[PDB]
Amino acid sequence: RTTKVYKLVIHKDDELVVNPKVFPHIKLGDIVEIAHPNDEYSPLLLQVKSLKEDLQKETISVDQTVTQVFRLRPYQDVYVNVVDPKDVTLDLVELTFKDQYIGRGDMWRLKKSLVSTCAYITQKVEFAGIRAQAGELWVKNEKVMCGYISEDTRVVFRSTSAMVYIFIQMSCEMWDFDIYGDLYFEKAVNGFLADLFTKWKEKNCSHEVTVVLFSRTFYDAKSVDEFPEINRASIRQDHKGRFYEDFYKVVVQNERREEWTSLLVTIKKLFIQYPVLVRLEQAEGFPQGDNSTSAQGNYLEAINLSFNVFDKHYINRNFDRTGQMSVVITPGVGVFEVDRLLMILTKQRMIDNGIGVDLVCMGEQPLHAVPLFKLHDYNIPHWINHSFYTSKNSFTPRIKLAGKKPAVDYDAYDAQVFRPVVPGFCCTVGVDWKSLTTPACLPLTTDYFPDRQGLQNDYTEGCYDLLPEAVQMTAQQVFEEFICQRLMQGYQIIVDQYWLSMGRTFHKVTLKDKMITVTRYLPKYPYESAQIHYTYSLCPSHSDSEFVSCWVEFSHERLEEYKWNYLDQYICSAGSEDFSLIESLKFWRTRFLLLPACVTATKRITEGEAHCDIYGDDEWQLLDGFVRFVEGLNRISTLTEILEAMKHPSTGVQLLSEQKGLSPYCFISAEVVHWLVNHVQTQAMAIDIMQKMLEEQLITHASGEAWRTFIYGFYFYKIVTDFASFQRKWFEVAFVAPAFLLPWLPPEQRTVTLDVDVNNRTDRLEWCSCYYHGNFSLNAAFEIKLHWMAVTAAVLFEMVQGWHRKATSCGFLLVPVLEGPFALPSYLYGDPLRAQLFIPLNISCLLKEGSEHLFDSFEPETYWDRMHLFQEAIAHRFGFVQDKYSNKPQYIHVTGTVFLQLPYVGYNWAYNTMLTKTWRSSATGDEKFADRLLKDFTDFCINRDNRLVTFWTSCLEKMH
Amino acid sequence: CRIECIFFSEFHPTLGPKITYQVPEDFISRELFDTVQVYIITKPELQNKLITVTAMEKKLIGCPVCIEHKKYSRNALLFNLGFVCDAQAKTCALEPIVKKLAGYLTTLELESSFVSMEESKQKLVPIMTILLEELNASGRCTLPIDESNTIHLKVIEQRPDPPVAQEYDVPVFTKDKEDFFNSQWDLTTQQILPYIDGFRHIQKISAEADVELNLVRIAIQNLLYYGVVTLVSILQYSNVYCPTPKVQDLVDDKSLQEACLSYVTKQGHKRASLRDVFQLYCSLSPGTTVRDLIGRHPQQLQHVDERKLIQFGLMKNLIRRLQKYPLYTGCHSYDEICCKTGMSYHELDERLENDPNIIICWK
Amino acid sequence: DNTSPISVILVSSGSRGNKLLFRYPRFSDVILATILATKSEMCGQKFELKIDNVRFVGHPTLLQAPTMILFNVVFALRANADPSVINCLHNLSRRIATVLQHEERRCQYLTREAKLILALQDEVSAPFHHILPKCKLARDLKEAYDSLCTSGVVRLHINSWLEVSFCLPHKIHYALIPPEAIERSLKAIRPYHALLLLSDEKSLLGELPIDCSPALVRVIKTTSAVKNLQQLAQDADLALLQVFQLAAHLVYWGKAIIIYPLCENNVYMLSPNASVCLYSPLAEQFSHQFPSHDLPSVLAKFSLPVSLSEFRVQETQLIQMVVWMLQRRLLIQLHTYVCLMAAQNPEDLRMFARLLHYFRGRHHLEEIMYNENTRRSQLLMLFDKFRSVLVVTTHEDPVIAVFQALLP
Amino acid sequence: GQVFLLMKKDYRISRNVRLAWFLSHLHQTVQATPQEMLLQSEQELEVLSVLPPPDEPVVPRPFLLVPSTRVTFLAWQYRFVIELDLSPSTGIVDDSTGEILFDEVFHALSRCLGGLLRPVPGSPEIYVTIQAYSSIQSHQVLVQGCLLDPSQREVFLQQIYEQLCLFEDKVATMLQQQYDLGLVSMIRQGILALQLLPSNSSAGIIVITDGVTSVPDVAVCETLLNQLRSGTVACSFVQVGGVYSYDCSFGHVPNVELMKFIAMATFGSYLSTCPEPGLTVYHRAFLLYSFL
Asked: Which of these, B129, B200, B133, B209, lies nearest to B167 by C-alpha position?
């Protein structure tokens, strides 16, 4: 224990400068303590990564950040005590994420990269684009300020940017006073919710918030009949002869915000307007209805609705959030009378995924076990994180005072005197604020392991081999990718044989003598899970008082049915054309659109312009921008006198050269047409002479299949002087160069395998698949869809951001876009909490006396394909362009904010929720643009100020 | 708990603190307000604290509220809406109402600026004009103010803290039951209610109902707190009771006579007289057990239940209990010792009758 | 202890601003000075204040180059304190305030022993727990606080010559007997009662002032558990009304207890609230004065009702064993009552009719003994002759059983 | 009903003279004499007025004397000696009154003096000698004179104020330097001061005590009262303080019975409270005198 006192030297690449000439015994990598000998402040441990004798004697230089963290004054005394790396080993380390999507495999790589390292508090750990942060270091159950991480330290990951779901049970107890003189709703909203929001603000979290209000209502009706046939689709019968209907109201959906205190007023307003909304009063054409009790409510179906919406995390995947959270707030104490099979189903869905459910009861803590299920017997649920929110004399009671119902053998009696939820351990009154502010991910490792002989009585034994070795990925990164691929499916390792466990399924992945062996064990008798058909009424977020009947199937996925043997082949082929992505695998997918940058009109609207119909309804300049963008995507007379002039190195055309796999003197089959109609008479003549030139067999296309005709556009061509591989490595887009008032009439997708490891930042190959529109036009959006399984999401996000910047330079927009914005909850792209908005288009003012509705001059045959053009003529005035998605017509705004559908009288309106703040720009407007567009569009569609007829009359003239 | 007036005041920037509204009008005279003015509109350190001040035979309750923001005159707004009662009113249950009301007012001002401008200020007078009657006559008030806020007030009386229930006590019903919705009980109260009869001690209840003893004791304590059940000593044919002076009151209070004669009366018999009851409550002796009286007053016990007789005497304090005090630390009754040991009192009799080391005492 | 005040504060106002002058032992020194210093319109009457869960009781004075207009001696208490405690403490505060005002009027005691502490606060500001022994006044307040917490009798001496005697009945009668019960029982006393004190007579005469009433000492000298008040009034040569007044005064301060005298045939038993702990702190004094006898072995004798002198110099020593344990409240005294609810005896009928307003169950046999002189045998035979009209009851006396911790 | 008889200043009727004329004019008619001749009445006493059984309107008509008739006797010149006790048993608070019974005694004395000389049923000179005694010295002489002209009272009260102010601080000092008999002795001093006032007419001794004082024994009390009635002097007790409730200062219980029993003897009056302001309580306790 040397006590060589020193003098501090401040420094501003390892953040520690020392001289071996001053510490000859200290080698590279050794720990170097730095603390003032006479300071009560905690010491500071670090690493001596590098050696440089030029550092001053009796002086060790460190960075400013670590010095400010450890509270070390400049020029002060210090110590240089060196301890062995076996005493300061930490016991538990915690890292948190922020505004980043990280798969479990990436977390595994980050953790195994951090091993055997010195880490202090609030350090910035970065690795291959992943950016974590230490926030709590524990040694022997004591919080420390710094420590060392060994091959046995506990690492925990949490998130500040999860996806949260909040449910509030509005049962009858919401309207009851508690023992302190306050309503239960006031306790829930003015209490718990405000505290949670304040904690989120304090901890700097950026979750995505969805808020739903739900209840259940019974009716006094004999045999249906009374219900108007229009709402009869959402009536269910209890097994006691009762007519009840479930209700759901959405307050906010998929919303990100910097403050949440402004939402409580909205929830209060909904509380006031509630009893009429759920048909307890003014039940016109309805029987008399009654609210339900919390124990008789629909608690177990809100959980399964959340499980449904969370089971589709792979669809429309974005790069900003990580983590899932579902919260149920109830006025009761934690007793419910639920169905017997739904409980087993929701337990199975709980044990399948890794999204733990949270319950926050608000009644007084009872004198028994909590929570309680009264089957239609009792059962204690051990998989619910429950809590009791105690609001901010003595002797608080613990029993609910029931309301008032309005109006011989004398020696034996003495002798015979001295002759479940019982353990109600009343201690859980705490509220786990830490689990509500930074949700913890599913642990990467587990300790449980069954008996070495009990597997024969429960599971079979499947086995398959793989030889990855037979620039190429070595047969050691493939094994790591094998281990990773299980992780994003929800697997955990048990604590180079690697065991893995998920539910009842077991995997073993091993490597030996350059060969990867996989062995699967699946249960012999997997419990069946019959789907539950569920019906409910839903009020969408944009709506005000409108309910829509919906139906949903509760099902449990068959984990043993996952085709784990095809995905391994896909990985082992490094994106070969032999194997592709099939829908059975839940491969991650996203969809982007490239749009014209109509900046002027959007800026005018954003500045305060009233009507948005100002979008109307230079070509080669935009063509140049598009060809430049596509180039960025790829990372790059008569007879023969014209050809000879083209071959001139300064007169004819450019020469695309200096590219791997690209033949010299190659040229783009589009710019040559532009120069030809310039130096040398018409576009048709240009393409015809180009086709003749190809027929002359001196200039062809680089693919080599000269049989194909000349295609004008972004196509590669060589001069002078196999097919699938070229089509799978380069982009190639063609160029396809009033209606409702007239006498007459009154491929498409290509695939490319991309390498993601641009600006190399990792030791392994990453690849994805890209499906893009086969042809481009200035009146239709350009669709590009990414499908990926094995990609570091940060690298892909960096590449996509590069694309976004390049397209911004070219006068376009590249925006992520929802996939199924008009699907019902039952379909794959549907959303149980989303329903389309309807806009009525009244054809009544347009109609004139005489002819009934319209199109009287036109033949009745052209009526089902001509009104469609009339509607699109109105749509084009609002910036909506056609979207030929990969059926019903779809239109998307140039801002990329709003969708539009023609049902087959009116429109279907929906929002694009995948446009976040980061993607926003000048062209896309502010965060309140779609809402202000709804108002103008709806008002124009009802012919406000006779704006509609002003359009019909003004367009009728062109017919004449 | 009557409310004489409800008054609203605030920090007027020009004339300083003064009253602004009263219901009824001019109930609080200015020369009275200008004295309690220090405790009504207070220094910032006193905000969000209940203040009860007695002056001029009146009792003023309030809770000053200060909201600090730049938009106001002096970067803060001061207001208080308080109650007036008589000097001797038991206003211990009127504090939560005032606190919640102040919370409602500050929420209204923070959300809709309800108190700042003079347009919504005039709406206060009908609000208090409703509050006074809704609270005095009913003690409950549900009053909507706007599209997001509705005032819900319910007054709760603060009953005294309950005693502790020991393992050997016997609970007896005093509200007669069958007057409440069993569905509205704590679901563990429903477990034990069919076992309370007036003859079962807490340990026996826990044994029969398979409920944790600590939980059963807490439940019985809660029932005591609400006043639904009472506790009496164990009943056995070897107890000894000494009459209490209050026995005389039995003959000098007609209501007590009626209640006693009704309760003590055997079911299925003519109502017992008072001459056969005042004798039973004076013929007991510290040397006569409940067994000698079976033959000592045979004619008298022909319309009464002996168990019910003794029970009723116990609850109304017409009878005291005599036990035996000898693990024999001294502070243990015979019944408690028997219950912990698990043997009968007669079994304990042939365990200290002939083993002289520690003697028997009656207290 | 609910009755124990949390703290004692002395505050005062005037033309120098509110100034907290003392506090023994969550509020600022400016907050308390601002709130507890009222204005002249509120002077001379009770002052009650409540904040959150803390109560303040006081009594301003109006205090009539002076620079002081009024002061206040406030006591802090828990929110759930009993109102009788509030009234008692207000009375104590007024008693302190009036003598302080008189001292101010005579020799300006206040604004001479108030600026020294004022300046000393600045000297210790380079203050109420380091300036206590620098000036007597805060010492008296601390003594009062300590006495209230422990003793229950405050014997204060201000200016070394003005006495202040105060008692707190809540902490005195803790055999926790309410003061109202004692007060009610003390207005219904009879000449056939006896006075008795625990302490020795020599140790009882040293507490009294230097100018007591001579009847006070006279009563103490000739008081015994055998005599009654009537046989005491003649011996001390005092009127019966004065004897009753003196007995009430002595009982009030806990220095006297009223019991029926020790006749040979007094019948006792153990008090229901007895404490035979076999290790009780009081059992360490019974052996410390009487070694040869064990308390759990002597108290066992009075299990059944037994006579006072039937072998319950051994007898001459046993009597002390019934005085020390009767000044302690271990036992009670039983009594025989009668209520109405032979004809061939006009002489007996006339006497029975004469003594007919007593048969309500509220008059004891010995009351009849004392009032209408009639031997025990005659009364007992009169009661035994009737066996169908009168009811015989054996229970304690509800007037004197209050002292042995037994409320009615 | 009641007959009022006035003294003469020149002479002094003995104790038996009143009984002698009560017996002599028994069953004899009497008359209320005219106003202007009462000063010329050469007889020893004067018959001011007589009333049949308030002021039962007595016209100037004769009335027959009866053995049951009540005869009250007044006088023309009176003397009184005023004694105070300032024992350390009078240095406590008076909770009901609000004051301390050191100023309240002065208030009672001032009120008694003021309400004793303001003013004649059916139709004047006072001497006062005041001294104050204490248990810790003997007595201080405060008046050896005091004709007491009625329109001088304020100056007199102000003057006797300082003689008690200077007294107060002496006792305070003597008890400050003390930490860090009785009534039987007082009454003696009452008689001694009496033989310094002019000539004849009944004398009075007004003592204002708190009741703490008590008589030592019975024989000494008999000796005191024998000498008290020897000189035919009326002694009165003006009680100071409130009720004798339990919560009083310890050690302080008034001896109301002793002073009442002394007041009934020697034809004295016991006053419970000094009331706020002819035939009044003030003018009947002292100036009046009866024998039956």
From this structure: B200
Domain check: are D165 and D22 in the same one?
no
Instruction: Name the phi and psi angles at A331, rounded to 5.
Output: -80, -15
User: Among candidates A856, A853, A858, A855, which has minimal Cα distance to A745?
Assistant: A858
Closest in C270, C272, C341 to B251, CB measured: C341
Q: How many CA atoms lie within 13 A of A732 on its CB side?
A: 21
Per the CB < 8 Å rule, is A181 touching B187?
Answer: no
**Residue in the structure block whose two tokens are 């920090």:** B11
- The DSSP H or E segment spanning D125 is strand D125-133
Q: Which residues of C touch A (CB under 8 A)?
A: 53, 79-80
SS3 at position C17: coil
Top residue of C13, C26, C35, C402 to mutate, by most chain B CBs within 10 Å, is C35
3-state helix vs strand vs coil in chain A, percent to 5 = 25, 25, 50
Q: Resolution to 1 decimal, in Å?
A: 3.0
User: CB-based contacts of D27: which residues, under 8 Å, 6+ apart?
Assistant: D64, D65, D66
Boundary residue ending a domain (C128, C145, C171): C171
Chain C residues touching residue B278 (CB < 8 angstroms) = 339, 341, 391
Q: Say how many CB pairs under 8 Å bridge C and D.
A: 106
Looking at the DSSP bridge assignments, the partners of residue A132 are: A125
Q: Which residues contact B182 (CB under 8 A, 6 or more apart)?
A: A402, B190, B193
**Residue C237 and residue C316 in one domain:** no
Q: Is B200 annotated as a binding residue?
A: no
Do β-strands A324-330 and A357-361 pair in parallel, antiparallel, or remain unpaired?
parallel
* Full domain range(s) for residue A796: 722-737+747-821
Q: Residue C185 in 3-state DSSP?
A: helix
Q: What is chain A's alpha carbon radius of gyration, rounded to the nearest angstrom?
A: 34
D212 vs C211: CB contact, 8 Å cut-off?
Answer: yes
Last residue of a domain, one of D21, D55, D73: D73
Q: Give dist(CA D212, CA C245) in Å, integer.
A: 13
State which approach was used to obtain the coordinates: cryo-EM
Residue A180 backbone phi and psi in degrees, to 5: -105, 10
Under DSSP, the state recorded for B21 is E
Q: How far from chain centre, in Å, is Cα A953? A: 47
Nearest CA in chain D to C153: D250
Contact present, D144 and D196 (Cβ < 8 Å): yes
Q: Looking at the complex, report in whole angstroms how far the Cα of residue A377 sits from the nearest Cα belonging to chain B.
A: 13
A168 and A227 together in one domain: yes
Q: Say yes or no for a CB contact (<8 Å) between B156 and A186.
A: no
The chains in contact with chain A, meaning 3 or more Cβ pairs closer than 8 Å, are B, C
Q: Which DSSP letter does residue A404 get?
A: B
Residues of chain D contacting residue C217, judged by C-beta atoms under 8 Å apart: none
Chain C residues lying within 8 Å of A393, measured CB to CB? 53, 79-80
CB C242 within 8 A of CB D211: no
Q: Which of D73, D108, D124 is the last residue of a domain?
A: D73
Strand A154-159, strand A92-97: pairing: parallel
Q: Are residues D148 and D50 in the same domain?
A: no
Q: Give the Cβ contact number of residue D2 at 10 Å.
A: 17
Asked whether the beta carbons of A559 and A760 are under 8 A apart, the reply is no
Whether omega before D34 lies within 30 degrees of 0, making that bond cis, reads no
Cis amide bond preceding A371, omega within 30: yes
Q: At C218, list the tokens.
A: 């006279």
Tally of domains in chain C: 3
Dist. CA B23–CA A52, nearest whole Å: 85
- C1 lies in some domain: no
Q: In angstroms, what CA-CA distances link D146 with B61, B324, D125, D142, D143?
A: 61, 82, 11, 10, 7
Which tokens hold the place of B300?
A: 């008298």
Q: How many CB atoms lie within 10 A of CB C274?
A: 22
Determine D/A contact with 3+ CB pairs under 8 A as the test: no
